[PDB]
Symmetry: C3
Subunit: 438 residues, 3 copies
């Protein structure tokens, strides 16, 4: 019982590929520190094929021969939802394509043996589809589910209050005519739960954000996840969320999702405070892994409240796919950051930073557009064009605002090699971005 | 037993208020991750009223109906000291106003049931007053107490070496004619314990700092907590301390206290190395929460060695009060920082940074006073007033010192909008503050 | 079972010295948070003296009277290898000088009682020498050993798969004519194990780096540990390694070693990604502690994945020595950093940062050599020598590179006090170092 003993992980370049169609699963960690995957193994993706629920353990850098969790002739298990409970017990749940029923299995010996604990009858609904990383909400452990009944769609929670012994439908997140389905739920503390959902086929470039402040009792539709630069009308699927906090305690939410139009799995972040206030405020997207064709379905494990270990599935062909792992390096996430905003010469900009104390560090950068591929660091410089002129900006910091004073040129002097070597690099207008760290 | 399972917390805007006079308690965390409060509930604050010791658990973002820990007709329980032991057992101790006796209660089922374990007779002392967050010192768990006998005052420790089964007076921190009372003790590692105490009524703007290097065997009076800018002669009460360490391991101490003159609960920090050396070196105060009238009495829980969760009590009227929670965002605390010091033109400043290695990051800021509301970032600039002159400062870094070379103006050029737009913003003197991060 | 209860540590200035020749041991932490030392106590260092294996616990800032782990008249125990297992059990192993046999002892009550579990016969080898911090690799716990047979040398692993009940020789790291001996092994995650070894007497200024990607099944000789500025041909001994990760999850390896030529114990770091790619990329050395004469033999304990607690042994005379503890303050380790590289005026430098996303922070520094004692921060400035010229560099950041544009002077203006106060401080050439943080 040495809680000080650390078991590190290295997922860089790791993969589970055996020429099957392995997909739609979750990665999590065992009590002993070993990473594992619970997923659907089959030889096709079409509904009614040979899907079975399996478990694989990462040992010595190699994924072990999968253990069969659930299998039945004539039955096609679909997505595999689940994860590790606080008790160390593992939960794996999957919907049977042919019946639309959800079957729940658990393991108390780190994946060696599995026991069937529950089967959710569809009842009046066309089906109940299990999908996503399970999570804890108070004394309840939850398995996310989405269902449909004709033209009606719903987002539900399959919960257990006795450690996974008994289950039953719990909170209802959504019920309407909008095809919300794959949804990630992230408990972010004391009653608050954030959710991001895929919209129908995923086409449209949007992911929907919802939030509850009472452990799922009630929900508010916050609108589409919004950032300065989005994803056009691209197909976005299988969102997943992670919680982390900065070097000094500031909480942030990390969103992973797969864009099947650009063929990349990306992540974006947002200050938790901003996420609670609304769906805007997300940061720019960062590619975490290539995602060809029907790839995606991400999951994560967070270490030390700051180190994200991730997994996604990628196709090698229309009938073969594997699990590929990675790590996300967030660096020091800003406590405050502006989007790119237009600036002009010899002007004053006042930005409310909204921080608990004055930021000890500030960075100001310049770009020629609000969606730049490159940008420059802004520092108070000088140039002479017949008269004495300042270039860049001077900065003032206080407990309320960060104020910037621009020179005759918002950036550029013409005196530095390659990137600022001509009179024409002296720009009177453009865009600035301010980042501040407490 | 999944030590990897994380239970996050969000205390922003949270409060426990039911129109009672709830006050003088402690917030801590249960082994299962749930936050709780142990405090005095009553319908008045005066001595001899109806104080009872109660316990409340934060579930789904709402504080539960309080469980009665200790109650007796005719007896008025005062401050509630205590917290969670390493074993998971909860300790709650309170002094009976009428008798001056300290009663200790414990719970092994996360606050569901409570058992009376000890009663400290006052003996020759006028009374023994329990107050503060309990803590571990080696194999001993301690409950802080302050007492008085006529004109004599003492700071004592009520300890247990068997997990809270038996108790007895232990180390004596102070004994003299100075009314030291409410005292926070912070074990900071291997024999060293830091203490900050309220002085009498709290008037005078000072908090006293003490330190022990032998687990409380002996103590040294380090003097009043000192920073460049203090709290005038304001009333300061109920200090509380927390231990945290930076992104690379540097330890710092965080002090929370309530100023009843300005009506704010503030926090300050200090490098542990500096705190061990003396009472000077504390950073500027940062308001954590409003504290009207007789508010205060802070407590904290630290996550990941860097995320402070806090609580304080606030009055809504002279006879009603509640518990209000918050979070402290420390950001990246500097490994070295100077106070504001006077600077002049075309001069050289040499600052010993005292770091284990040369700092990789340095920030230099400028202000017109040593207690500024706003300041500017200092960067090597230029201006022409008939002659060629430098503005700001150039920086040299080494394994021993940070050296700064100032221009004809310590700051200002007159070429930037709003904050540096006139010849008069070119200043030859002022104050600089240097911050460095390893 | 309160995993939230934190036990801090403070090793600054701490030492275990009782006028014996205490040396060649390991420091680790108990499940209850107490630090301990397992080492060789004797009254001489020569082979065949009175070495016995002992255990000391740090309580209240003072090392306890050593408990005898292993002792036998006529037998001289040498180096003491071992540490704390995931189970909380302590392992201590030492080679008997007279027989060349390795004896393994374990304790299940935090060092109170010890039980002999195994004795490794030398067989055909001249001897098997236990040395270093033990570690976990999958389901195996390992004790590092080095051996020799005539002119043949080998690096071996003594492992147990049942929690230390039974042992046996396992993986073979090296076997050849090179005298590799004292070797530190660091599991860095899922199959990868890094190793750094002392070469013979240690003379030559080199430490050898090896790496395995299959839990020790196979090994690759990566060459000598390489940095821009090494250790000449100095005597380097007893390397030790630690694993840590940044504020946002970036992994780094920390190497401690003792230089008996300069008489200092130093540490260097390296991005794990770089260490996996090869033996180059290590950072500059930082002195952690003086190491007079035959001092050295470092060990560490890491808290919060970022706080290194260390120990080494130091001689006070040729026949007396003690254990001295310390702490390493890493600060924010750069995600990318260049060595010092030559720069010239009005030029453009393009540096591939190799980061997962564009770095949010960049620092550029200037020095007159690639092994400077001091350096300056580079910021876009200006000066006039009859014509308009830029000084320093402008910076461009993108998702692939960091680009720098230099002025007529790579640094210097002649307008700032002390360090940049003459026309001669305007330099057209020199060296730059770029550091970037995600």
């Amino acid at each position: 019982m040495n809680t000080y003993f650390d078991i590190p992980h290295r997922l860089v370049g790791k993969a589970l590929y055996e020429s099957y169609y392995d997909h739609f699963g979750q990665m999590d960690i065992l009590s002993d520190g070993s990473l594992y995957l619970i997923y659907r193994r089959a030889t096709e993706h079409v509904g009614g094929s040979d899907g079975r629920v399996v478990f694989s353990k990462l040992e010595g850098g190699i994924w072990s021969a999968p253990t069969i969790v659930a299998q039945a002739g004539g039955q096609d298990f679909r997505d595999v939802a689940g994860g590790t409970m606080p008790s160390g017990r593992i939960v794996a749940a999957s919907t049977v394509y042919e019946t639309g029923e959800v079957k729940v299995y658990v393991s108390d010996d780190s994946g060696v043996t599995w026991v069937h604990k529950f089967t959710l009858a569809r009842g009046g609904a066309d089906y109940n589809f299990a999908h996503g990383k399970s999570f804890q909400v108070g004394a309840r452990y939850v398995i996310p589910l989405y269902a449909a009944t004709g033209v009606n769609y719903e987002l539900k929670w399959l919960e257990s209050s006795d450690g996974g012994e008994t289950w039953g439908e719990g909170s209802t997140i959504y019920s309407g005519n909008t095809p919300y389905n794959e949804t990630s739920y992230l408990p972010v503390g004391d009653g608050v739960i954030l959710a991001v959902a895929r919209v129908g086929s995923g086409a449209g470039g949007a992911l929907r954000q919802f939030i509850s402040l009472d452990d799922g009792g009630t929900w508010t539709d916050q609108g589409n996840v919004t950032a300065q630069n989005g994803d056009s009308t691209d197909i976005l699927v299988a969102p997943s969320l992670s919680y982390i906090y900065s070097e000094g305690g500031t909480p942030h939410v990390v969103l992973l999702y797969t864009n099947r139009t650009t063929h990349f799995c990306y992540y974006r972040t947002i200050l938790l405070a901003r996420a609670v206030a609304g769906s805007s405020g997300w940061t720019e997207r960062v590619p975490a892994y290539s995602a060809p064709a029907a790839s995606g379905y991400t999951s994560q494990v967070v270490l030390g409240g700051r180190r994200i270990l991730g997994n996604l599935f990628r196709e090698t062909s229309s009938t073969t796919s594997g699990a590929y792992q990675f790590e996300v390096y967030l660096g020091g996430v800003p406590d405050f950051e502006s989007d790119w905003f237009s600036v002009s010469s010899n002007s004053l900009y006042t930005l409310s930073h909204g921080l608990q104390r004055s930021p000890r560090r500030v960075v100001v950068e310049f770009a020629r557009s609000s969606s730049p591929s490159t940008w420059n660091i802004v520092m108070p410089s000088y140039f002479n064009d017949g008269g004495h002129k300042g270039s860049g900006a001077q900065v003032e910091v206080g407990s309320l605002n960060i104020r910037l004073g621009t020179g005759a040129a918002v950036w550029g002097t013409g005196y530095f090699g390659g990137i600022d070597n001509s009179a024409t690099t002296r720009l009177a207008t453009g865009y600035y971005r301010v980042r501040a760290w407490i």
